[PDB]
Design a binder for this molecule. Structure first.
Ligand code: CLA
Ligand code: CLA
Ligand code: CLA
Ligand code: CLA
Ligand code: CLA
Ligand code: CLA
Ligand code: CLA
Ligand code: LMG
Ligand code: LMG
Ligand code: BCR
Ligand code: SF4
Ligand code: SF4
Lengths: 126, 86, 617, 132, 257, 126
């Protein structure tokens, strides 16, 4: 008949598909909450994410890419950072206020250094 | 831990220090303002994020800025009283 | 483990698909893989519909008598039904034009539907396989050339299954032949073809082959325009996503309009409920897509744009002018539409309906008469009558439609105002000069500086989504009442009572709810009982959204703290639960606003769907 | 020497100016500067210091003379206007379809050349302004 | 009592609160010098003998005249405690940070709280009542005591020597780099954590990008396995003329300033 | 730790203290069995009457099945709690975290089945 079919298949599956599947999904999500990889990609400093970052760095330093990539350090893009600073030094000496005692490398060290211990990647003793 | 920063525009009011309910801001000597003192935040881990320090800063805009980081909540940042995570 | 708070759920689940923040699969290959998985889900959803239509459905009985049979969606096997309700219900009826679509595209049996379900499942498997192997090679797939080729192939399918394909002489083997031979499968008659009361399948196939060829040509022209003047200066997933979402919203809204006025599915206009649901659904989808385009434009401004003297830089520099002029437009439109509606309300209330301000929509009437209508209906602009007119379902406008279109303009302009204002102030306002360093979404900047509630760019979308839903509600009320009057042959109750808003209440909402509320009562329950129940459920969801929107966190955080105290002080449970595992904390401000908006719009959609079903049943 | 705050600001300005003028050249090597992203394509600068388009903006026809492009755009305009007029008004082709006969391919091919004439005259003025 | 409080010890109910916080919240860590700002800042050390954990004190003479309340910390459900040690001049009433009222002792006083915010609020109240030497301590799960609030002996409202500035950014708030400028870097979502050098560099980089008249084409990589394409443009001559342009542009720019 | 007669009088101390969850001298299985018997005998009640099949001869049997289902669901929830939180409040020396609580929940399931069966027996009889 018309009713038969979906009746038997439903009596088998609808209890399964709703009860068993949804309850298993809820229980597995609660387990995933207590799992070590709980939202690992969105929790800063998580073990899986940090290991992935380390392995990405290892692959980048072991298999150099012929194409140029976005520099993680914006100053790391420079093909010759030495020449960059040497020019800065020459320009600064050209426009130094009188016999100023301030040099370019000290200023670059002062600007690059920063005391932000509470920023992560620094709270992980890194 | 909600990152809290101090900028050059700080004029050593000490109001941000007095407004902090968890002793995050702290007055260090400096040579950038007439007060010869500048706020610092060495105990950001205690910052709840209430932004009372920003309410008490008299500069044109906030010489002390509290950047809420909801993806890095802490029992000290969440102000937990009945749950301990330590 | 799991020594986090419940805030972790709503914090990550709000960015769970913000893959740019997911450093693992951050590459564009992963995003294409996500597209493949989404298309697999879409294919499985269509397979669901086709499988339940072919399994427990009357498509074989539908093709025979498309006017006298009601399409069946799926078999109902709810254990909670009472024998009577079981005897009462036959099966879950159909609220979508899938029967009409299958009939149009040449389905004549349940065996064809079953093969279609198998093909959909196999294609979903193919999509999953493609998603298994993200790769720059797969990034080659796609493009306007690919979609135009899909259009050409769909044209080929429609040619193969056109009603006149039987009379078609094989062109590729016996030559093109006479023009009528091609007219068996490729026509440009234009408009409704009578009988099926829909566009001819030949028209649709010819449309698709033309669109595919033109799209191939346009893609080639765009790529040679990329040959010289090759400048991909601003590439961002959010910029391209905003482009795609805005174009898709325009296309979906146009689909709603031109599918009501030029139905392409056979015997669709005879089914009032499916037509109304189609229009409402597609308009909601189009509005959502346009809002998403604006949202992703704002996101691109927030975290992918670098200030320059470009188009966006010029827009940002004079953002005050844009916001001020949009505010003026919205103020004028709202003031005048509301004032004219209130004046008409007062005149109708005071027994003087003649003294209402009925501004005739003479401009739209001029456009309609000069460009669309083939007979003199209004007589302004032109009065010529077409010797060989074509048929369609373009409504005839009247005085109330002027005010309704001004309400639509007010809604659209206010939504655009909120979205543009938020996107352009993501770069900073004088209350929040450094919004470029706070991300797209954040709670607030505290009670200082007078208060900074809802100052985030995400809060701009949160505020504008109410306006999106309100505008769609306004023009869907317009469409629904217009088509209800046309189908009920009133066409004068609308044209008179839509001038004042008490008409919009009494004759539209209060009047069309009579049958829906009688879905179940003391006497019994009929087939509309499910929709009355869904009506109530949607109202409940809407008011829960009210809870999440009105009451804010601090109260609820203190209340949850007291509840935690009760749990930790409760017997037989302090030994088991120390609140350290998944600490129960109140929803964050952004999470609360989003969840309140979600309940609001869920109740909105379900309420209007139940009302449409109960009114056009 | 008791460096002034204004001296520190001067150094910041000097650093910013030097960096800005240095990263433009081939000593920074960032993905943005890759051909077809931000730069002007190697040997084909589109415009100079003054914002005047060079002949390189035309692409393959970057050395077709101004006179030849003027002739091309005028012939395309004339042929396209003839095709459009012969398709829409004079001997209409849709009415020919109503007669049961096919379109005239000459009219369609002719009318296809109007946007060709548009871009051709724009390129012609670009060439003329560049002295080509 | 078993119905009043759970029968198991706080450590038993805690389970693995540690070794799970390190997993659930790997970001939640204190810097190497938590109460202070510089490593060479004395760092006075106190032990449980000075400030014992509250479960080891019953009817201590240093407790104030407090009648107990439901608003205190969660014994056996939380292990972290914050203690205040202040010396009074006279016995007067004060508001507990957890509501209710207590009366201070004539001499030494000692209170225990869960959150440091309660201790700081009580310190503000006491200092408003002319009380010095308000010392605030933190009690850990294992009993290690960390001295807080006047960490270097001088209250933070008063500037003191030996305090290195922390989280000090040498510019204005809106002089931070924009997120789009710091894209693909570790500071993309947190431009306020970038260095001054990095912010200045990216703010100059965005200006450099907007000068395509002098921007360098940056030739395509050679990825295909076949022979190099002959092309029609000399990259060496372009590089030389770009060096000349860069030199002259830098000279003119430095002449301007 | 505040003191109230409801939570600190000798009756409260010796009542909560003598319950299966806290009574001295009880093995974990005994606590589970007793709590389960109580819960199962209670749960048959609200299902035999106040249910879909109230006025049927099999009302008691349907109530028993529903009570066993509720006992099983709450026992699965307790197993989930023991697997995630591992309360450790009942574990003996050594062993593993949450072993005692898991044993308590398993014997609670057993006792729930037993008590539900006993209630169904007392309903069918008498
Ligand atoms: C969007 C997908 C979808 C949905 C919502 C439903 C909904 C329903 N199906 Mg169903 N079905 C589908 C697809 C779907 N079907 C497909 C593709 C098939 C072919 C294999 C079937 C075959 C099928 C049978 C044979 C039966 C149902 C039945 C039912 C009903 C009870 C639920 C059940 O037991 O499902 C069981 C369904 C399956 C075991 C098939 C798996 C469903 C598909 C393949 C998964 C799609 C997932 C989708 C992409 C979303 C994933 C994301 C999600 C996590 C949010 C319910 C009306 C039963 C019924 O009518 O009883 C009253 C019944 O007997 N369905
Ligand atoms: C193809 C289109 C498309 C794509 C690819 C994206 C992609 C993205 N969007 Mg986006 N968006 C889109 C369309 C799109 N959007 C549209 C159309 C809108 C307007 C409505 C928006 C509005 C929007 C906002 C406002 C935000 C994003 C954000 C994001 C990013 C993170 C997504 C995330 O994790 O959300 C998480 C997703 C969810 C939490 C899903 C919610 C689950 C729903 C509500 C369930 C409710 C339905 C329920 C079953 C109904 C029950 C009924 C009841 C009666 C029972 C991601 C890049 C975020 C971002 O980039 O911020 C940095 C962000 O804040 N989007
Ligand atoms: C846009 C292109 C397009 C689309 C979407 C369809 C869609 C459809 N066609 Mg079709 N068709 C097309 C072009 C297209 N056609 C062309 C160009 C021709 C002329 C050669 C035909 C000739 C044709 C015939 C003769 C028939 C269909 C049928 C069908 C229907 C069921 C087919 C199915 O899934 O089972 C068949 C497919 C599978 C079982 C597996 C799918 C094949 C691979 C594995 C997946 C493809 C992946 C994808 C390309 C990416 C379905 C609605 C059938 C029907 O009943 O429609 C009324 C039918 O009998 N088509
Ligand atoms: C994917 C593209 C595609 C494919 C594979 C086909 C396949 C086919 N077309 Mg077809 N067609 C297509 C696109 C396509 N069409 C488009 C876009 C148009 C619009 C111009 C047409 C217009 C068309 C006509 C007018 C005719 C065909 C015919 C045919 C059939 C050729 C004879 C045969 O069965 O040989 C094995 C075959 C089924 C002939 C036929 O007999 O089909 C019924 C025929 O006369 N096609
Ligand atoms: C009925 C409810 C309602 C009404 C009337 C408004 C009205 C308005 N909203 Mg609004 N809003 C609402 C609900 C409502 N909102 C909700 C629920 C949300 C979700 C949070 C929002 C979110 C929202 C946002 C995010 C924005 C607005 C904006 C606006 C203004 C748009 C300009 C306009 O139309 O001016 C017309 C004003 C009215 C119709 C108000 C009534 C004025 C009188 C009573 C009617 C006219 C009478 C007569 C002509 C005057 C007599 C003059 C003389 C004889 C005395 C307007 C004041 C935008 C704005 O302020 O831009 C300017 C904007 O950005 N709203
Ligand atoms: C939602 C339905 C449901 C669920 C999830 C469980 C769950 C469980 N049952 Mg169960 N059970 C149920 C209904 C259910 N029961 C019903 C209706 C009956 C009556 C026939 C039983 C009879 C039953 C017995 C006789 C036993 C279980 C046992 C178990 C456990 C293995 C587990 C906790 C076993 C157990 O005690 O595990 C410790 C066991 O021996 N169940
Ligand atoms: C002391 C043990 C005991 C005894 C004597 C009975 C006695 C009986 N049971 Mg029973 N039962 C028991 C424990 C017991 N039950 C337990 C622990 C369970 C849970 C698994 C059940 C589940 C159960 C079911 C599901 C059914 C019985 C039925 C019956 C009757 C046959 C009879 C009155 C049957 C009945 O209803 O008879 C009227 C029946 O269908 N029993
Ligand atoms: C019928 C359907 C209509 C109802 C759906 C309407 C939903 C409106 C669409 C807007 C969705 C995008 C909004 C968004 O992602 O950001 C909305 C916010 C964005 O996420 C917020 O981001 C902030 C910083 O950007 C902070 O991190 C907040 O903590 C974080 O919540 O997401 C949330 O608030 C998610 C909380 C609710 C998650 C529950 C999951 C529900 C799944 C059940 C199925
Ligand atoms: C039906 C669910 C089947 C669960 C039976 C498994 C079982 O007996 O408990 C197995 C574990 C019991 O507990 C587990 O095993 C040990 C018990 O000694 C440990 O001590 C911990 O309790 C835990 O690892 O329960 C679960 O994992 C149930 C998960 C339910 C999720 C849904
Ligand atoms: C009224 C009242 C009260 C009380 C209440 C309650 C709490 C009740 C309960 C009651 C109950 C709740 C009871 C119970 C009972 C139970 C039982 C009686 C059981 C039994 C069981 C059994 C006997 C089992 C057996 C077995 C086993 C063990 C296993 C295997 C199987 C068998 C069956 C063999 C009060 C004081 C508060 C106050 C007021 C009054
Ligand atoms: S209130 Fe503002 S300006 Fe004054 S010391 Fe604090 S941070 Fe500096
Ligand atoms: S937000 Fe509140 S707790 Fe954080 S530093 Fe500012 S005042 Fe202190």
């Amino acid at each position: 008949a018309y009713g038969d079919g979906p009746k038997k298949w439903g009596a088998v599956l609808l209890p399964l598909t709703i009860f068993g599947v949804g309850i298993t999904a809820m229980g597995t999500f609660v387990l995933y909450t207590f799992s070590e990889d709980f939202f690992w990609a969105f929790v800063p400093g998580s073990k899986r994410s940090m290991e992935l970052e380390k392995k990405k760095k290892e692959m980048a330093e072991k298999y150099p890419s012929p194409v140029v990539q976005h520099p993680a350090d914006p100053l790391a893009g420079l093909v010759n950072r030495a020449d960059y600073e040497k020019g800065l030094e020459e320009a600064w000496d050209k426009v130094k206020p009188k016999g100023s005692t301030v040099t370019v490398e000290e200023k670059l060290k002062e600007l690059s250094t920063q005391n932000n211990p509470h920023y992560w990647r620094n709270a992980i003793k890194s | 831990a909600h990152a809290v920063k101090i900028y050059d525009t700080c004029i050593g009011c000490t109001l941000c220090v007095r407004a902090c309910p968890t002793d995050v801001i702290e007055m260090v000597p400096a040579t950038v303002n007439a007060a010869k003192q500048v706020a610092s935040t060495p105990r950001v881990e205690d910052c709840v994020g209430c932004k009372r320090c920003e309410t008490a800063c008299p500069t044109d805009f906030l010489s002390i800025r509290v950047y809420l980081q909801e993806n890095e909540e802490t029992q000290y940042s969440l102000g937990l009283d009945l749950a301990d995570w330590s | 483990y799991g020594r986090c708070a419940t805030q972790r759920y709503f914090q990550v689940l709000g960015n769970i698909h913000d893959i740019e923040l997911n450093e693992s699969l951050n590459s564009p290959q992963a995003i294409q893989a996500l597209s493949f998985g989404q298309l697999s889900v879409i294919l499985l959803w269509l397979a669901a519909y086709t499988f339940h239509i072919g399994w427990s459905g009357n498509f074989e009985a539908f093709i025979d008598n498309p006017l006298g049979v009601q399409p069946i969606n799926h078999f109902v096997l709810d254990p909670h039904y009472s024998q009577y309700k079981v005897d009462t219900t036959i099966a879950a009826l159909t609220n979508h034009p899938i029967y009409h679509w299958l009939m149009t595209v040449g389905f004549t049996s349940n065996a064809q539907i079953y093969r279609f379900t198998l093909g959909l499942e196999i294609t979903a498997a193919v999509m999953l396989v493609l998603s298994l192997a993200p790769s720059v090679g797969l990034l080659s797939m796609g493009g306007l050339e690919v979609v135009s080729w899909i259009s050409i192939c769909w044209a080929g399918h429609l040619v193969n299954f056109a009603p006149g394909a039987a009379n078609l002489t094989n062109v590729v083997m016996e030559g093109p032949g006479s023009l009528g031979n091609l007219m068996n499968v490729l026509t440009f008659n234009g408009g409704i073809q009578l009988g099926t009361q829909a566009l001819a399948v030949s028209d649709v196939a010819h449309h698709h082959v033309a669109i595919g060829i033109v799209g191939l040509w346009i893609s080639a022209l765009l790529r040679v325009s990329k040959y010289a003047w090759n400048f991909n200066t601003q590439s961002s997933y959010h910029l391209d996503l905003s482009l795609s979402l805005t174009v898709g919203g325009i296309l979906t809204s146009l689909l709603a309009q031109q599918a009501y006025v030029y139905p392409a599915l056979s015997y669709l206009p005879y089914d009032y409920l499916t037509t109304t649901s189609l229009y409402v659904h597609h308009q909601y989808i189009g509005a959502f897509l346009a809002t998403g385009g604006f949202v992703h434009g704002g996101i691109f401004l927030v975290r992918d744009y670098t200030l320059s003297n470009d188009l966006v830089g010029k827009l940002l520099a004079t953002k005050a002018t844009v916001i001020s002029t949009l505010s003026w437009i919205t103020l004028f439109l709202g003031f005048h539409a509301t004032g004219l509606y209130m004046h008409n309300d007062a005149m109708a209330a005071f027994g003087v309906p003649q003294k209402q301000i009925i501004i005739e929509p003479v401009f739209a009437e001029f456009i309609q008469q000069v460009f669309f209508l083939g007979t003199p209906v209004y007589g302004l602009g032109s009065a010529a009558v077409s010797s060989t007119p074509t048929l369609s379902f373009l409504p005839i406008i009247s005085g109330g439609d002027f005010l309704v279109h001004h309400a639509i303009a007010l809604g659209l302009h206010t939504t655009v105002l909120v979205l543009i204002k938020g996107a352009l102030d993501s770069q900073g306002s004088y209350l929040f000069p450094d919004k470029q360093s706070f991300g797209y979404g954040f709670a607030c900047d505290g009670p200082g500086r007078g208060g900074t509630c809802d100052i985030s760019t995400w809060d701009s979308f949160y505020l504008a989504f109410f306006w999106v839903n309100n505008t769609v509600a306004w023009f869907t009320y317009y469409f629904h009442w217009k088509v209800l009057s046309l189908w009920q042959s009133s066409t004068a109750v609308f044209d008179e009572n839509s001038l004042y808003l008490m008409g919009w209440f009494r004759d539209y909402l209060w009047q069309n709810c009579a049958a829906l509320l009688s879905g179940y009562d003391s006497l019994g329950s009929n087939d509309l009982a499910v929709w009355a129940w869904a009506f109530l459920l949607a109202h409940l969801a809407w008011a829960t959204g009210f809870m999440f929107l009105i009451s804010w966190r601090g109260y609820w955080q203190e209340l949850i703290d007291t509840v935690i105290y009760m749990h930790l002080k409760a017997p037989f449970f302090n030994e088991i639960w120390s609140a350290d595992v998944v600490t129960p904390v109140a929803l964050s401000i952004v999470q609360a606003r989003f969840i309140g908006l979600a309940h609001y719009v869920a109740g909105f959609i379900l309420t209007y769907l139940a009302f449409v079903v109960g009114a056009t049943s | 020497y008791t460096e002034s705050a204004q001296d520190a600001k001067l150094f910041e300005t000097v650093f910013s100016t030097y960096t800005a003028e240095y990263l433009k050249g081939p000593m920074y090597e960032t993905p943005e500067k890759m051909i077809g992203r931000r730069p002007f394509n190697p040997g084909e600068p589109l415009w100079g210091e003054d914002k005047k388009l060079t002949s390189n903006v035309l692409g393959p026809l970057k050395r077709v003379s101004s006179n030849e492009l003027a002739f091309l755009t005028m012939i395309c305009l004339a042929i396209g206007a003839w095709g459009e007029a012969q398709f829409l008004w004079f001997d209409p082709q849709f009415a020919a379809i109503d007669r049961g006969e096919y379109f005239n391919p000459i009219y369609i091919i002719a009318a296809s050349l109007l946007p060709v004439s548009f871009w051709a005259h724009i390129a012609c003025y670009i060439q003329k302004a560049n002295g080509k | 009592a078993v119905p009043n409080t759970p029968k198991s010890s706080p450590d038993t109910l805690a389970g693995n609160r540690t070794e799970a916080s390190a997993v659930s919240r790997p970001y939640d860590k204190f810097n190497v010098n938590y109460p202070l700002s510089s490593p060479d800042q004395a760092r006075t050390e106190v032990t449980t003998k000075e400030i014992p954990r509250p479960e080891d004190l019953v009817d201590s003479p240093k407790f104030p005249l407090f009648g107990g309340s439901a608003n205190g910390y969660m014994s056996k459900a939380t292990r972290e405690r914050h203690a205040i040690t202040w010396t009074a001049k006279e016995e007067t009433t004060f508001e507990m940070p957890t509501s209710g009222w207590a009366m201070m002792n004539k001499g030494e006083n000692l209170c225990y709280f869960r959150k440091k915010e309660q201790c700081i609020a009580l310190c503000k109240q006491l200092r408003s009542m002319k009380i010095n030497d308000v010392k605030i301590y933190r009690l850990s799960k294992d009993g290690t005591v960390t001295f807080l609030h006047p960490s270097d002996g001088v209250f933070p409202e008063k500037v003191n020597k030996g305090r290195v500035p922390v989280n000090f950014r040498p510019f204005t708030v809106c002089q931070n780099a924009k997120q789009g400028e710091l894209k693909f870097t570790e500071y993309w979502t947190k431009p306020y954590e970038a260095d001054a050098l990095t912010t200045l560099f990216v703010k100059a980089r965005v200006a450099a990008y907007n000068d395509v008249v002098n921007l360098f084409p940056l030739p395509n990589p050679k990825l295909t396995s076949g022979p190099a394409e002959p092309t029609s443009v000399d990259y060496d001559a372009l590089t030389k003329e770009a060096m000349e342009g860069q030199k002259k542009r830098i000279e003119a720019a430095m002449a301007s300033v | 730790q505040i003191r109230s007669p409801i939570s600190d009088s000798r009756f409260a101390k010796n009542f909560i203290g003598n319950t299966a969850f806290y009574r001295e001298g009880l093995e974990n299985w005994q606590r589970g069995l007793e709590i389960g018997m109580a819960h199962g005998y209670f749960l048959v009640g609200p299902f035999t009457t106040l249910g879909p099949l109230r006025n049927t001869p099999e009302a008691a049997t349907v109530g028993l099945l529903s009570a066993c289902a509720v006992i099983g669901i709450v026992s699965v929830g307790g197993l989930l709690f023991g697997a995630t939180v591992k309360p450790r409040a009942f574990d003996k020396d050594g062993a593993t975290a949450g072993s005692g609580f898991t044993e308590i929940i398993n014997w609670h399931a057993v006792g729930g089945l037993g008590g539900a069966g006993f209630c169904h027996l007392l309903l069918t009889l008498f």
